[PDB]
Design a protein around this ligand. Sequence first.
Ligand SMILES: [Co+2]
Ligand code: NI
Ligand code: NI
Ligand code: NI
Ligand code: NI
Ligand SMILES: [Zn+2]
Length: 231
Amino acid sequence: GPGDQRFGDLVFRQLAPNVWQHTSYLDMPGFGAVASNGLIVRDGGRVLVVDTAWTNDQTAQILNWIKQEINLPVALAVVTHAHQDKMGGMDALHAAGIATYANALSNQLAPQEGMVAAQHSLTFAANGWVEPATAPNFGPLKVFYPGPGHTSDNITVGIDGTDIAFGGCLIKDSKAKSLGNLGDADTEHYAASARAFGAAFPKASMIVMSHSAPDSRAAITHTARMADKLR
Ligand SMILES: [Co+2]
Ligand code: NI
Ligand code: NI
Ligand code: NI
Ligand code: NI
Ligand SMILES: [Zn+2]
C-alpha cells in the first residue's frame, strides 16, 4: 500500500475507498502533541465532514486537502460535541460557505464552552436516532445520540455501506488507562451511553475515535468497563 498522507500540519489516513480520517495536533503542556481525529466521506458527488480540527487554520487546511485530493464540494459538516478539538474550527467552515450541523444541546453549550455554534441544530427521537427532518442530505451518515457520557451533548456517527462507526471522544481504545478529560462528563450515565452506541451500530467492526488509531469493538467494551467504575 501507501503511507498516511502528510498535508500541511495534518495527517490523512484512508480507512475505506470513500472514507478518510483527518488528524490535527495541538501542543498540551508536558503532554506532548495531542492528536484529534475526525472523518471525511465522499458521497457520490459531494464531500461530508465529521468534526473540525483544533483550530480554524487547521480546518482550512482540511478543506484545501479535499480540494486537491477529491475535488468535490463539501456539502455539509457535522460536529459531535462542544469542545475545541471537535468545534474549534467552525469559523473556517462558515467562511467557506459550508452548512454545519450539531446537536441542539451542543449549540446551547457553545457559548459557555467558548465555541462557535453550528448553523443548524439536530434533534433526536426518543430512541436516540436523529429526526430526519433536521438532518437533510446526510446520505450515508447515520447520526445517533447515545446519551450523556464524555459530555451531555456527545453524539455518534455511523457510515452506511461500511464497517465504520465513529464514537468520538465518548469511546477510548481497548487499552486506555482512563476516560481522560471528565470535566463535563456525566459519570452516572456514562457506562450506559457507551453500551448504547455499541447496540446502535451492532455490525460495525472498525471503531474510530478522537484520540487514537481505529480499534475493534473491544474499545466499546473496555470503555464501558472503565465507565462502570465511576458510578
Ligand atoms: Co474561531
Ligand atoms: Ni441553513
Ligand atoms: Ni420523531
Ligand atoms: Ni438517569
Ligand atoms: Ni479491557
Ligand atoms: Zn470533548
